[PDB]
Symmetry: C7
Subunit: 249 residues, 7 copies
């Protein structure tokens, strides 16, 4: 019905305008435990996957804009503008090492900043999908296939926003886990103090001994818990759907 | 059986009469927590999606009315009418900041007004579906395909009403969460009072210290809970089914 | 085997005899809460849907009777017979308003009458399905297709009876919810009495204050519970299956 | 292998010999509650459905016997042998009415007799399926299709026996529910006695009042429970499978 | 590869050698309760089904042996070798009758003997399946189809063994239920003794009365429990798979 | 690419080299209870099934080696190298018999040795699957089909190892059950001692009687538990996949 | 669009560059229990499977690089550069043996080192998948099929990383199980001490005897628990997807 070729060209420019940049904050391990460091490296890898697939999606949108320009060419002309030591003795050396690892590092501040950035990116991605709306005037069959391709791009972007939210939730979960670990695990200073209450009271040991044994058991329940809850699934984003290909007329 | 062309024309006008406008209330964050603000922005985005897809549905109904007019043209004539500082000291600065964020903002009044508007819209949408009923007299095959298309429009509208209800439930859930957070989290004035009971009693500290430690723990359980329950799924409405296309005779 | 054309004609009259009328009681909101009023309006809408689809089913049965008459015409002749103010003070104004809304209205009597009518209609519908039985003597292929069409009408009617039961259960559930809400929510007279025990004892307030705080908390747990359990699904009856179409011979 | 035509004729007579009659006991409501009466009417309707579908199955078996006679005709000759008043006062009038309804009627004796009859019918139906066994000597393709048709009749009869058991279980469930209701609901004589302990002791009321309030609450929990557990699903038996049709030779 | 016709003939004799006879013990009701008698009759019917289907399987194996003999005929020659009174008073007459029914009958000895026989039959059936093994030398396509048919016979026999185990478990379950019923239900002699402590102490009744009421309640919980757990599913064995048919050469 | 016929011949010899022999330990019943003996016989039968299917798999591998030799023949030449008494009295005779059965037999030592052998066989089977690896140099279509056939043999062997583990777990479960039964069931010597404390104290019986009644109840809970947990599923190994057949060239 | 043949050649070299070597640490049994040794052998076998399938994947990548070189040959020229004793007495000999087995061996240090190596390998594998990205300039149909083949290689590598994580979790689970077993099982020195408190106090035995019986029961609960939780599933990696085959031009 005297198709607006200009509408198609304008939508082609709008489709492949750059979207907001994903965050680039680096999540640091909250402590020196191996499970914590592995969780941080998993988060780094997942953020790398997200950035790579977002760039791939921008390439898909560029191809889609090209196909829309080719479809607009079927109505005429386009003016292309742009060109140990002892048996039986309390360890205290493993307990002390566990506490030392738990209290070294930023305790999860980096994780929280990471999660805030990706939650913001989830909202930002959801805000930028008017570029995939249907057309006002253009109809037919090039139009319907183009509309389906744009809606596929929209669904993929929404899925990417959901994955951003999931990765941010994972970072927050690891941060909460570290906070819980700091709370129930016995303090380094408490351990050192109880260790001096075993070299400054050979007499008193039958009060010091069960206390140590409590501390030991708590340490074991924390580290083990830390090791099991901290294993994270990698985020595995789907590849963006291939744009509809439309040859020049 | 001497088909009522007039019935088809009347149904065409009735199908694409404007439906009730969706609500336009803006949901405000109930507090200054990041989770609360992100929940409010998620609600804003979901309401935007709902309004956009409702407008798209009205366009689909306009196309359907055109197809019904074309089908009526097969029986003759239509008269087209219309044209920090220290180690080991109590923080009190993070606790105080948490309380300050919890008590600033409207505490959920805006959320409740938002939810009421969308619940009302759910009922309003369900009340406006007589326009998709079957025909009295028209039968045949244009009639049956047209009836199927109208029932598809009806099912899509019912699904949109259900989604309106779901979004309103989400707003109410966030409001209830904020109310719970206000209840169990320690008050700003209680925190300030306990902080003056630590600069006006250096003596008394071994009674003040565990009390603080209780407050701290409660603060941590509230904020964390607030952060996890407040993440909302976006509302993702299905695109309205394409109207049946019927060319002029 | 010398087919009883008379049996087919008699079954045609029996198929489209009018069934019992659905109930027409209007369910009133049991109170002035918004959730209660929305539940009542949802029930009104669902009853409207049920009445509309039952009328559509009667139209389907009329078409089926016509097809049976056409099938009877293949054996000969048919003789067509028929032609707030202060910070820190107790509210008492929200508590009092909540109680006032809870005790105004019929408290669920209308809901119970509604539910009784629809439960009776469930039984009534199940009692009227002998009209869809198979035939005594007529066999063949018109007969088998007609029998299948009648059984489809029977299954649809049974499903409608089941939906009637479900809607009645929903009305009873809302009535039971309102009864529970009346029980645990603090009485209006108790609230007014406790409010006069705060203007006639400035002295006594440190006994009055926690009592209020209990009442407040109970009010919050009731209203919130009322708001969440009272959201009802709309009843969405399936469209009656299209009758088998059989042209005159 | 010189097929026993006589075996086929004997099996034809055995297939359509009359099976045991279903029970005809009428289940009466155990009390005057609406839920109880509706449950009894549901049981009456389900028993009607069962009797109707059993008669339909006997008709199917008669058709099957005819098809077996037609199949026997392919080997030769068959000799066809056969030819309120105040605010704030205790009700006592709703409580008393509830007790009166609970204790009137047979208390479930009729339900138990109904259930025994249908359980017996379940066993009786399972005992009568030797008539659907495979053939001794007849083989081929008429024989295999006939064997499949007989096994379909057997499976349908077994399903009907299972449904008989289910309906009997429903009757027993309603009877057990009424027994539980009689136990926890406050007695009519206890209610009348407590009501005379409120007109023969205006003094004593602050001991009588909470007692009433207990009774009231118990009444509400019983009736409501009675109303919810007593809603029964209708028994919906499948139509018997159509017999294999075999024309005379 | 110079097929062993003798191996096929030997396997034909081995396939249709008689298997072990199923047990023929009759399970008797453990008591005089209706639920117990119905459970015993259900077990009788299930054992009848099992015996009937086992005989049918032996017929299938006989047909399979015939098909193997026909397949062996394709290599040459086979030498065919073989040729109440008062209101308000304690009942004591229903309680006494319940106890009398519970203690009459063999208390489950017959059930245990039944279950032992069928468990033994499960093991016996599993021990007799070497007759369905694959062939040593015979290969090709008659051989592969014959091997598939033999494996189908093996799978059916294994399923029948599993069903034998299930039926034995049902008998054991009913026996255990009766033992539990004997334990918690009040003894006949205890009932008679308490009934004489109500005609030999009109004085003492306010100690006798609650005791009776306890007994009554226990009786009701036992009989009801007995009625619900004792309903058994019929065992419904699948028909044996049809043997592969192979005509003489 | 100048296919290594020698590689195919070497793989043919490696494929059908004998695998490790399955264990041959016989599991003995741990006691004289019928459930224990039936469990032992079930284990014997399952081990028989496993040995039979493992021998069948070795035959399948021999056929596969033949097919590989035939495939190697397509490149030229292969040099074929190789050529009671009283009512109301305590029983003590059933209790004593139960204890006697529980303590006779090896108490599960044979079961543990059986389970160790089959767990070892699980590991042994998993260690011998390098013979099913893909080929170094041979490619094409005979090679790919041969590789698929070898991988099918590998998957079947892994499934057989898993079944070996499952059968060993069943043996360990029965052994643990017998150990539990020995612990909670009353000792034979304790029973005999308590029986002499009933013939050497007619006076003392009202202390002896409840004690017996405790023992009786414990006996009943053990034997019943022993009977229900000891029923074992037969191990039903899948038939090995048929080797790919490849005729000589 | 003047395809970059050089890009395809560079990607061919990048695809089949060697990936990081899997770890080669040998997991040792943490103790002398049979379940522990079997778990260690299962871990050894699973690590062997992982190493074998990783080498197979490298072979698949080498084939893929060859196919990419063949596809690059369709645009011209490639310069191939590279060329016991008593009844009734306490055992103490089984208890002592159980403790001795529990405390011998490295107690799980080897398991922890194994798990760390494989968790590191999981992260390492996820870091090396840029070699499977899509192409910059090459498009068409060889390009799209090649891109699909590369993405299949990527998905298989990600699955292998996930399996590495799972195997490491299994090793950590067995290590945690052994730690729990050491904690609740009675110490060897405690057993020896209690055994000397039975040869140096014949008097005292009625205090020593229940203590032993406690120890015995604890031993039984530990070993049994150790035996059941320690059975590990083998890791069964999928075979790498076959590379796309592309013949020279």
């Amino acid at each position: 019905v005297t198709v607006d070729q200009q509408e198609i060209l304008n939508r082609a420019n709008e489709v492949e305008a750059p979207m907001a940049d994903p965050p680039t904050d680096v999540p640091i391990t909250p402590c020196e435990l191996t499970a914590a460091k592995n969780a941080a490296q998993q988060l780094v890898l997942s953020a790398d996957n997200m950035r790579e697939y977002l760039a791939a999606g921008a390439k898909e949108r560029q191809r889609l804009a090209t196909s829309l320009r080719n479809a607009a060419k079927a109505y005429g002309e386009v003016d292309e503008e742009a060109a140990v030591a002892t048996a039986g003795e309390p360890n205290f050396m493993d307990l002390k090492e566990a506490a030392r690892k738990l209290e070294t590092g930023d305790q999860g501040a980096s994780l929280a900043h990471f999660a805030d950035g990706w939650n913001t990116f989830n909202l930002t991605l959801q805000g930028d999908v008017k570029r995939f709306r249907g057309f006002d005037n253009w109809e037919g069959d090039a139009a319907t296939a183009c509309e389906a391709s744009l809606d596929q791009q929209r669904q993929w972007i929404l899925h990417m926003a959901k994955l951003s939210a999931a990765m941010a939730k994972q970072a927050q979960y690891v941060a909460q886990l570290h906070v819980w670990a700091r709370r129930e695990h016995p303090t380094y200073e408490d351990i050192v103090g109880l260790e001096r209450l075993y070299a400054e009271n050979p007499s008193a040991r039958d009060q010091i001994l069960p206390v140590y044994a409590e501390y030991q058991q708590r340490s074991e329940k924390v580290l083990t818990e830390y090791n099991n809850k901290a294993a994270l699934e990698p985020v595995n984003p789907p590849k963006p759907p291939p744009a509809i290909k439309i040859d020049p007329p």
